[PDB]
Amino acid sequence: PITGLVYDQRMMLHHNMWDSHHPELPQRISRIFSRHEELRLLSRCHRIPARLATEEELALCHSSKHISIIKSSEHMKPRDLNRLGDEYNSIFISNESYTCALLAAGSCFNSAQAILTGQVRNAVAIVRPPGHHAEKDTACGFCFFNTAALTARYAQSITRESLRVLIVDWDVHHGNGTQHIFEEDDSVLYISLHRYEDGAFFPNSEDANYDKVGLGKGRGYNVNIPWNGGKMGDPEYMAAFHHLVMPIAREFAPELVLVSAGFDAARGDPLGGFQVTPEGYAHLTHQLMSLAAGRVLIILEGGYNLTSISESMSMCTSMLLGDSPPSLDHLTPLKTSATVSINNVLRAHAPFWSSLR
Ligand SMILES: CC(=O)NCc1ccc(C(=O)NO)cc1
Ligand SMILES: [K+]
Ligand SMILES: [K+]
Numbered sequence: 178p179i180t181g182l183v184y185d186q187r188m189m190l191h192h193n194m195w196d197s198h199h200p201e202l203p204q205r206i207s208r209i210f211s212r213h214e215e216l217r218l219l220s221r222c223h224r225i226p227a228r229l230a231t232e233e234e235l236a237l238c239h240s241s242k243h244i245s246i247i248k249s250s251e252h253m254k255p256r257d258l259n260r261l262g263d264e265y266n267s268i269f270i271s272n273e274s275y276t277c278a279l280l281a282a283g284s285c286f287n288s289a290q291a292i293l294t295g296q297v298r299n300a301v302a303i304v305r306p307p308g309h310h311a312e313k314d315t316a317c318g319f320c321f322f323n324t325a326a327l328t329a330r331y332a333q334s335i336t337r338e339s340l341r342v343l344i345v346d347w348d349v350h351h352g353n354g355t356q357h358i359f360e361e362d363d364s365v366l367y368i369s370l371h372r373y374e375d376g377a378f379f380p381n382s383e384d385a386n387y388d389k390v391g392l393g394k395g396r397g398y399n400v401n402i403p404w405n406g407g408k409m410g411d412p413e414y415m416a417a418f419h420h421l422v423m424p425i426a427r428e429f430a431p432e433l434v435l436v437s438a439g440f441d442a443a444r445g446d447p448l449g450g451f452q453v454t455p456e457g458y459a460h461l462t463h464q465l466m467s468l469a470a471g472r473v474l475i476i477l478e479g480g481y482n483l484t485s486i487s488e489s490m491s492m493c494t495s496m497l498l499g500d501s502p503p504s505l506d507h508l509t510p511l512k513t514s515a516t517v518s519i520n521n522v523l524r525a526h527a528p529f530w531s532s533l534r
């Protein structure tokens with residue numbers, strides 16, 4: 178029972194040259210890596226090497242136009258980097274951004290291959306920039322290519338096209354790119370939990386609402402769990418996993434589990450405003466390990482409080498390594514609004530998932 182880990186400091190080169198304090202900091206991944214060292218987690222892992230994704234692997238999910246444009250930014254002067262970045266919603270670009278997005282995706286491909294060939298049971302990928310807001314034809318929300326989506330398609334390309342992949346997105350934002358890439362696809366189940374507030378939270382679209390259940394053959398295979406009405410924490414996330422995430426996942430029976438693991442729902446993050454604890458994330462990980470014979474890959478997305486993301490992702494790697502789940506703090510009763518959300522998702526997905534109660 179071996180846990181893999183992939184990290185490469187070259188992904189720190191991506192940076193905002195007009196705001197050195199932009200929250201999507203190079204030091205996100207370095208701080209996480211150091212905490213793994215300090216807690217003696219890194220030494221217990223098998224170290225998976227990082228690599229560049231190829232242009233053909235990007236074509237698994239992204240259009241040739243979008244690859245061509247981001248690729249061209251490697252040679253742009255700062256004035257053009259600024260112009261191009263402003264053509265997207267919430268994007269900054271440097272000369273290293275294209276290469277770092279390649280490394281993030283390729284690092285995850287290597288970890289998926291390591292899991293699928295039996296070299297490791299599960300794995301953690303400490304990567305940046307994130308991916309789950311990137312769509313087929315455009316970058317968005319600090320994301321250039323959709324790393325989690327590309328990894329699912331990569332996993333299928335090296336096994337069989339019908340490989341059942343579950344993607345759990347517990348980043349506090351809706352992974353619009355991941356939903357849309359797989360919207361008509363019943364081979365990849367997308368489950369996202371996210372702050373919604375009636376469509377006023379980034380990325381500010383009703384695409385994130387519970388009633389978007391998929392299209393065509395993929396009806397039932399897109400599960401949005403939207404939060405309305407202020408701060409949520411461990412009790413709401415534990416209830417959502419108990420009533421929705423784990424019953425649907427068990428009925429889907431994935432062969433590989435990818436976590437789009439933002440840590441911006443963590444206590445202390447200003448961009449999320451939630452208070453999921455490191456012990457909370459440990460329990461979420463431990464539940465997911467009961468699926469897919471333990472084939473779980475945890476992929477960093479967002480998460481912007483440096484101390485919070487370091488403690489929270491370390492807690493996840495500790496669970497993958499087999500440590501006992503930590504004792505949870507007091508679980509306050511479910512906020513009425515959280516009950517409403519879980520009930521809305523249950524009602525919307527009752528047709529597709531016979532397990533639901
Ligand atoms: C200031 C602001 O709200 N900018 C928009 C925005 C915010 C967060 C993300 C993200 O990726 N979070 O994990 C992306 C875009
Ligand atoms: K999410
Ligand atoms: K789907």
Ligand SMILES: [Zn+2]
Pocket residue numbers: 348349350439441479480
């Ligand atoms: Zn986020």
